[PDB]
Amino acid sequence: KIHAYTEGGKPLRTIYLPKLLKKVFLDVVKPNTKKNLETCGILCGKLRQNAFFITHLVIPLQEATSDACGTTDEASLFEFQDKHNLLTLGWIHTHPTQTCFMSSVDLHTHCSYQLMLPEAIAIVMAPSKNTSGIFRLLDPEGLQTIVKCRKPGLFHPHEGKVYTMVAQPGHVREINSKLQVVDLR
Numbered sequence: 001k002i003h004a005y006t007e008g009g010k011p012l013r014t015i016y017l018p019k020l021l022k023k024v025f026l027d028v029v030k031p032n033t034k035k036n037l038e039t040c041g042i043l044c045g046k047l048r049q050n051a052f053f054i055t056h057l058v059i060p061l062q063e064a065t066s067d068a069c070g071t072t073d074e075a076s077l078f079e080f081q082d083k084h085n086l087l088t089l090g091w092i093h094t095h096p097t098q099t100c101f102m103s104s105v106d107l108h109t110h111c112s113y114q115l116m117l118p119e120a121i122a123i124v125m126a127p128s129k130n131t132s133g134i135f136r137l138l139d140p141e142g143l144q145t146i147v148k149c150r151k152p153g154l155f156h157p158h159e160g161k162v163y164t165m166v167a168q169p170g171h172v173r174e175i176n177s178k179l180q181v182v183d184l185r
């Protein structure tokens with residue numbers, strides 16, 4: 001039995017993550033990584049008995065670059081999530097050649113995730129360098145920094161420690177659960 005807490009003491013509910021998810025996602029977006037392109041996908045699922053279970057990897061309509069990859073139809077995703085009663089628990093994306101780390105845009109993106117949902121996680125694939133990582137912002141020091149950060153330019157550095165890695169064991173907990181990929185493209 002694990003109880004995890006935030007930098008400021010808020011308790012963190014567990015997130016159950018399918019062991020298959022990471023490689024399945026890497027497979028689904030292989031067309032972009034072999035083409036050296038960033039591909040993101042949304043981690044959805046249910047609140048059941050005070051924990052979150054990730055049940056769906058939703059791949060949104062998106063615009064992929066070598067360095068970022070936002071969603072480009074937020075409405076089709078919301079329809080889909082509303083239809084199937086699916087909360088957002090985080091997201092995952094590929095760094096095709098780059099290392100395993102949270103880029104500057106990656107922290108601004110995750111910031112609005114972790115604001116909606118304190119437990120939210122960002123998963124990062126580095127398929128060339130053969131690494132992955134599950135990250136979150138520091139709560140509150142790191143959210144504070146990124147909410148105050150209206151500074152410009154998309155690789156802009158950040159003051160002090162901004163993000164960290166969900167720990168092992170943690171509030172993220174890998175299990176052998178079934179998995180559904182939903183490709184919205």
Ligand SMILES: [Zn+2]
Nearest residue numbers: 095102103106
């Ligand atoms: Zn990134």
Ligand SMILES: [Zn+2]
Nearest residue numbers: 108149151156
């Ligand atoms: Zn910034």
